[PDB]
Design a protein around this ligand. Structure first.
Ligand code: NAD
Ligand code: AMP
Ligand code: GLU
Ligand code: GLU
Ligand code: GLU
Lengths: 649, 339, 339
């Protein structure tokens, strides 16, 4: 295998291009297209989408009906097709073409010396600044073939272009207005199997239009679990009544992969690596998507599938994609603030409901001064505040076996604090069974005591284990910290916990004294020796839990995100001294530990999980919700996949 | 004429409500619904949308299958319908209902003492945190009638509720996941004539989901030249495995008319005056919209149109709408910088 | 002629196998399958049916959605197919397979180095202990082809596999729950010409379920004048929430030809010689059977018939069948008392 090849990892590289329009001069337009397409080739792109009516210019009005213009368009199109024999990407080029009685506003799908299909625009705006029906005919419902350079090629709205050697890549093409109507051709195409939706746009620019384009391209890509590749006309179109901004953009399942400079001087491209496995995974999981297809079975089985062999480059061509280091912790501060606000409120409201249901028990919690229990104590307090409950109904316990932050926090919040030395009970218990067992006797007796206090004092025990510990089975099962009456941290990965605590400080709601202690807990606290660095395990957890990606794919993504500490972004709050970079050798190492612990060892611990709220869109680990799996399975195949596919370093 | 009447100027006042859920207690849910609906009445609203499975609670899993729960749901529904004789707005209330072999996840459209129609959710998520197919049957392609309180009433995904004395207001209803699939029932409904698209949602909350809901309600309202009225479940739903945020929002042709506090303490409503003339005008002008309908002629002519007379208030009830002074000059500095 | 050859007298030897499951390890499952299939070959069997989702294990839940698991299942399937070049029987092996948007719960029909067809389960139970719709899509109404190891092979619920050199033997395949609904795929299949109906089952075991399986396999074999060959999962499936009994059985027109030890230690096979002439004769005589077919003409003429040449052994391979000495006098005393 070639491990550094984006293509071997299920990426397909796509380009949305805005060329230099020379209105009424198809040879010039084709020359611009050819030069841009050669760039895309050099970049290893599989697909290059151009603006609406590329070969003629969108804005030439009745000039579209002039024989000489239409003749020159055909001549130029045939030169492109001939040049394309030597080009890697599929080209999607706009052209006004004669068919039957009229000219259609078409997109010509070109590949390696041949036309694969010709797709007419379905809906022709004839209102406001648009007069398309005057010159051109609607495509909706046209099928059959069209004669282009002595070949008959598929013509119609119903076409799919499928890469035979790259099944994750199935292209559908629509044109501008097509994506703006209640029931766009592209939505039927996705249900039929299209994963990459191209849009060639003319789209003269006005105030607020770029937002409209975004809204509709983004929502399409999200609703259709697809990449959406968009290219609008720019410099060169007529400014008789309109201006043009050259916007290009590429979306994937709601996310922006890439976009280009609006109103550029010169030509611009958006080029990004689309993750076809991501789309595969989303679709595999959202059954209502296939349900929608079955309900429109007639619509969706009638697509014609045109095959082509892409034969993409096998080597290292980099990865044109932003892989964030912390799938659970957004690097953008605004986005991160939002997530924290949401995580916190989810935690609190989850607990408020359990308390209301139990007619307001006392809350029993073991506080050790560590990140997880500190955070849970804060969550507990807020929940009690919001429900008009006295903080003194929170019973915090320090349970020394064989830290000051804990008592300081508790006194500052004004909850009820208490110490109980478990060492004697532990000595007694270790002696009685005649003595991991030593760590576990203490861990268990903590929980035992808390539970008994909860019976005694009319409370429930608050769990504090986080998602990353659930993922790796890093807890003492049953009698131990795995067990509780309600776990507010169960959905929060460890990498996020520190940011929630900051978030709480920064908001300032609990006052300056509390904030100081919380700050201290952070400063002080920041087992990763045996289970690996949580940044890496939280990374793998997200990939596995959301997409079920194979190990080698996870290794590739993590290495791109982590191998170089100067590249990419770091969320707020990583002093440049705590900004590690990881080698492939390390990433491989921790992944072996991860698949073995996640898929095999740890599930029984998750199987009997107390209640608590899902937090992350990445998923949570409740055997009653996101993660249904066997407690008695080996991880051999994942381990073997790493042996086979991930290089040693 | 009454010149200060929003209704006389083509506005229809709509509400998206999030009530207090008491799981497994339909009488309690109905009581919350009744009290919110009376508020909407007082506000002169024409329409009040509630959360998914309002009368039972969305989150009660196999308790949905308990006879006593289902029986209590029916009793409570019938009390609502009876109370609605005196209420101005059309109520859209969620309820698990028996039909043929199964229980459907439905929205009951109630008006002035009668059930206009019952609309089953079309797509039942059964993946990640969702198990809907376990307890409930898909609605897509169900038609006919359902027997509710000794009357046969239209049942199915294909229904339009049209105000006979207010033609700009044509209601279609869908449920949660319905708006998330490539071809949502609401998109066909809009081509058929629906102008106000309701969505009852359960929608447990997670990081980023509120954005997802916005993305999809906003784009639908824009692509369908419609108002989109959305109501999610909040306080009271089970937190066995999920939390809830009570989000309500009202969109119009891509613009936010109104939205409510997330994670509220207590019930919240979004109330806004939707401009039916604005929707009328946009549609009159964008011929490609009518073109889309003609292309899906079979899909779109098969809708059943249920008539009702709203008889809205004729007087001055203000205008719950932000009318900017400078249609060409946005008041928000960020937006103005952009323009 | 060879007078001692069961095949020359219109018998076809069939096997229902329960293998050793290693959950999440398709290579291991394939190896157990290959070893069992070689036994069947040695026995001169024409057909070998395995448990539901053989190559992955039925009980692995969301692990079915893991790329590495799905990839490994494909790899293993292609190895079986290659090994099958040297095996006499048609193998029917379970496998979760990607098609279009989803994974289908399928049975792969393999013969002499090729895949003849891939059959998706039609009805996916999502109730009580079953969550199938969560991971896998329904097969009912899927047609077309699926791409397996660089070949396009028939895909769908409508397939018949007909031995060209043994016309009494026409195979149809369904999966577990398929035989439990009022109108099972296998019943249309028998009207269309299927004589041997296979069922791959997962079927976690509970009190009384073995009876349920018998009731339904027996009645099917009787009402459809057919052999019914049934194979359930056993040792190795996860016991996170369920236990498994490994039951295999083979019915013919209401009669038990063979069954295997429940809760075995190790793998078990039921092997029996099915009398295709018996089925032929029953059908020739019961005209109401052909009448049923003509009434469902559309349903029954739409089956796709995939041909294969079995070329069974010509020599004496005994007769794996209990032929009673007194067709009119049952040897079982309780049965004789009744008669
Ligand atoms: N930071 C934390 O959250 C935390 C807390 C306590 C311990 N730890 C670490 O984790 C360790 C806990 O040890 P552990 O995980 O071996 O203790 P454990 O008791 O939680 O796990 C093993 C126990 O469960 C049984 N078991 C194992 N697999 C099973 C399965 N599939 N089904 C049913 N039962 C099964 C074992 O036989 C044994 O009794 C400590 O030694 C410590 O280093 C971390
Ligand atoms: N010394 C301690 N005092 C009180 N509670 C503790 C103590 N140590 C651990 N706990 C509790 O047990 C949980 C597990 O911590 P740990 O095993 O140290 O990772 C903590 O989050 C606390 O809730
Ligand atoms: N019908 C859309 C078209 C926008 C575009 O072409 O970009 C509008 O009028 O805004
Ligand atoms: N399809 C969405 C559902 C969002 C909702 O139902 O509010 C998901 O990823 O879970
Ligand atoms: N429908 C049966 C299933 C029996 C089986 O799958 O073997 C039940 O739930 O009882």
């Amino acid at each position: 295998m070639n491990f550094y090849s984006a293509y071997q990892h299920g990426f397909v590289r796509v380009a949305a291009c805005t060329h230099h329009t020379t209105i009424g001069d198809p040879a010039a337009n084709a020359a611009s297209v050819l030069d841009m397409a050669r760039a895309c080739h050099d970049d290893g792109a599989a697909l290059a989408v151009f603006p609406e009516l590329t070969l003629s210019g969108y804005s030439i009005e009745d000039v579209l009906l002039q024989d000489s213009l239409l003749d020159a368009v055909e001549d130029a199109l045939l030169d492109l097709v001939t040049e394309s024999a030597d080009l890697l990407p599929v080209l999607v080029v706009g052209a006004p073409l004669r068919h039957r009685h009229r000219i259609y506003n078409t997109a010509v799908v070109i590949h390696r010396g041949a036309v694969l299909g010709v797709v007419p625009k379905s809906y022709l705006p004839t209102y406001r600044e648009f007069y398309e029906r005057r010159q051109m005919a609607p495509g909706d419902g046209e099928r059959g073939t069209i004669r282009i350079g002595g070949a008959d090629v598929a013509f119609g709205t119903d076409l799919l272009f499928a890469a035979s050697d790259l099944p994750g890549f199935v292209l559908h093409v629509e044109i501008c207005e097509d994506m703006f109507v209640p029931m766009p051709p592209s939505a039927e195409a996705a249900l039929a199997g299209a994963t990459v939706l191209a849009n060639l746009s003319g789209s003269p620019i006005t105030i607020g239009r770029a937002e409209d384009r975004r809204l509709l391209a983004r929502s399409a890509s999200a609703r259709c679990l697809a990449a959406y590749v968009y290219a609008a006309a720019g410099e060169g179109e007529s400014t008789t009544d309109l201006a043009w901004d050259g916007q290009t953009m590429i979306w994937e399942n709601g996310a922006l992969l890439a976009e280009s400079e609006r109103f550029p001087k010169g030509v611009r491209r958006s080029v990004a690596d689309v993750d076809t496995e991501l789309l595969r995974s989303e679709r595999l999981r959202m059954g209502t998507f296939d349900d929608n297809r079955r309900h429109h079975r007639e619509l969706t089985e009638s697509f014609r599938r045109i095959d082509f062999a892409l034969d993409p480059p096998a080597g290292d061509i980099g990865l044109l994609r932003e892989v964030e280091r912390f799938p659970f912790v957004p690097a953008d501060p605004q986005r991160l603030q939002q997530d924290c606000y949401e995580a916190y409120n989810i935690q609190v409201s989850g607990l408020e409901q359990r308390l209301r249901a139990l007619d307001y028990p006392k809350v029993v919690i073991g506080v050790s001064g560590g990140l997880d229990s500190t955070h849970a104590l804060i969550v507990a307090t807020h929940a009690m505040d919001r429900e008009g409950r006295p903080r003194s109904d929170i019973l915090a316990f320090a349970l020394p076996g064989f830290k000051n932050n804990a008592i300081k926090l508790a006194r500052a919040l004004g909850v009820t604090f208490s110490e109980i030395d478990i060492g004697d009970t532990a000595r007694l218990m270790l002696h009685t069974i005649g003595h991991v067992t030593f760590e576990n006797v203490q861990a268990g007796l903590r929980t035992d005591y808390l539970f008994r206090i909860a019976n005694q004092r009319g409370g429930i025990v608050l769990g504090t284990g986080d998602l990353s510990e659930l993922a790796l089975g890093w807890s003492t099962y049953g009698v131990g910290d795995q067990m509780s009456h309600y776990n507010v941290n169960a959905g929060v990965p460890k990498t996020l916990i520190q940011h929630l605590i900051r978030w709480v400080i920064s908001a300032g709601e609990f006052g300056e004294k509390v904030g100081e202690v919380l700050q201290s807990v952070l400063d002080t606290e920041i087992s990763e020796a045996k289970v690996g660095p949580f940044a890496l395990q939280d990374f793998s957890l997200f990939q596995v839990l959301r997409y079920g990606f194979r190990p080698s794919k996870i290794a590739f993504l993590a290495w791109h995100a982590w191998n170089d500490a100067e590249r990419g972004n770091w969320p707020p709050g990583f002093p440049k001294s705590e900004r590690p970079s990881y080698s492939l050798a390390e990433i491989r190492h921790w992944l072996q530990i991860f698949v073995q612990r996640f898929y095999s060892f740890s599930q029984f611990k998750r199987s009997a999980l107390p209640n608590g709220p899902k937090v992350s869109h990445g998923g949570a680990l409740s055997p009653r919700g996101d993660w249904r799996a066997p407690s008695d399975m080996s991880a051999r195949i994942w381990l073997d996949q790493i042996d086979r596919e991930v290089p040693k370093g």
